[PDB]
């Protein structure tokens, strides 16, 4: 899934280049004003679009136009290459701690998909990597937040560590990680708290949890359909504590892809996984070249 609208807007511009055997410099400029326009309408950060247009234009008006064995193929290769680089190049794999367990801290705003993604990530870790993960209920403030995560764990046959809602998340994380050491769990996934907007009470708690958990990974969970808002959430989260990755949720509803194309360029935090639905299997690793190909109508 993902990017359906941007691909539709770019189909004519790109295909016109693909269908010709000689690309003039006026053709590349004409393609580039329409590519610029499509990226801006897809809510890509406008400074990212500016840098992207210049980088592609400088390379496109080069050896590619003058060599005519496949001039059109070369204009498209550069766009694919630059789209791939923009989104991170190669897939960004989950880190493995030197001493187990590997502790993964899930953070984000309410409604972004934290709790659901924590279950998805555990499921993915056991299936694709044959690890033994433990889930942790560290969101005490919202009722049914614990029972929701427990209900997910009861579908995965995976433990969900909880001490109720009368106990600090700092203490819950401390006990969970130290139980995980004793019983040889590979991964610990902390489902943390969060309201609708960032506040001081939230970073203080998250800073304290990071302090005692000393996590190998801190993943922001953020809603892909919120566009530039998601890019701003990542910037704040990355500067007030340290983000190591991003999970983009609800691409099954994101036709534009602005956040997907903007987050790494603005924050330097890589996007590691994409959420693609409500079910626990709906999580795939973020592959930048495949996304670039899906953007150019080159999908498998
Ligand atoms: N389609 C889709 N949906 C996702 C994905 N990830 C999460 N969701 C939805 O987002 C909503 C919030 O998920 P939570 O896991 O409760 O998020 P939170 O902990 O950050 O609050 C849930 O819907 P809800 O609370 O039942 O309803 P609503 O909030 O959507 O109205 C869930 O179904 C995804 O990858 N694709
Ligand atoms: Mg939640």
Residue numbers in the entry: 1 to 300
Give me lines lifted from the publication on this model:
The stringent response enables bacteria to respond to nutrient limitation and other stress conditions through production of the nucleotide-based second messengers ppGpp and pppGpp, collectively known as (p)ppGpp. Here, we report that (p)ppGpp inhibits the signal recognition particle (SRP)-dependent protein targeting pathway, which is essential for membrane protein biogenesis and protein secretion. More specifically, (p)ppGpp binds to the SRP GTPases Ffh and FtsY, and inhibits the formation of the SRP receptor-targeting complex, which is central for the coordinated binding of the translating ribosome to the SecYEG translocon. Briefly, SRP recognizes hydrophobic signal sequences in the context of translating ribosomes, and SRP bound to ribosome-nascent chain complexes (RNCs) in turn interacts in a GTP-dependent manner with its receptor FtsY, also a GTPase, which localizes at the cytoplasmic membrane periphery of bacteria via a membrane-targeting sequence.
The (Bs)Ffh-NG domain also bound ppGpp and pppGpp with similar affinities as their GDP and GTP counterparts, respectively. We determined the crystal structures of the pppGpp-bound NG domains of (Ec)Ffh and (Ec)FtsY at resolutions of 2.5 and 2.4 Å, respectively, as well as the crystal structures of (Bs)Ffh and (Ec)Ffh in complex with ppGpp and Mg2+ at resolutions of 2.5 and 2.8 Å, respectively. Each of the alarmones could be unambiguously identified by and placed into the available densities. The ppGpp or pppGpp molecules are bound to the G domains of Ffh and FtsY and occupy the canonical guanosine nucleotide-binding site. The α-, β-, and γ-phosphates of (p)ppGpp are coordinated by the G1-element (P-loop), and by residues originating from the switch I and II regions including the G2 and G3 elements, respectively. The δ- and ε-phosphate, which are covalently bound to the 3′-OH group of the ribose moiety and discriminate (p)ppGpp from its GDP/GTP counterparts, point away from the active sites of both GTPases. Both phosphates are not coordinated or form any obvious contacts to the GTPases of Ffh and FtsY.
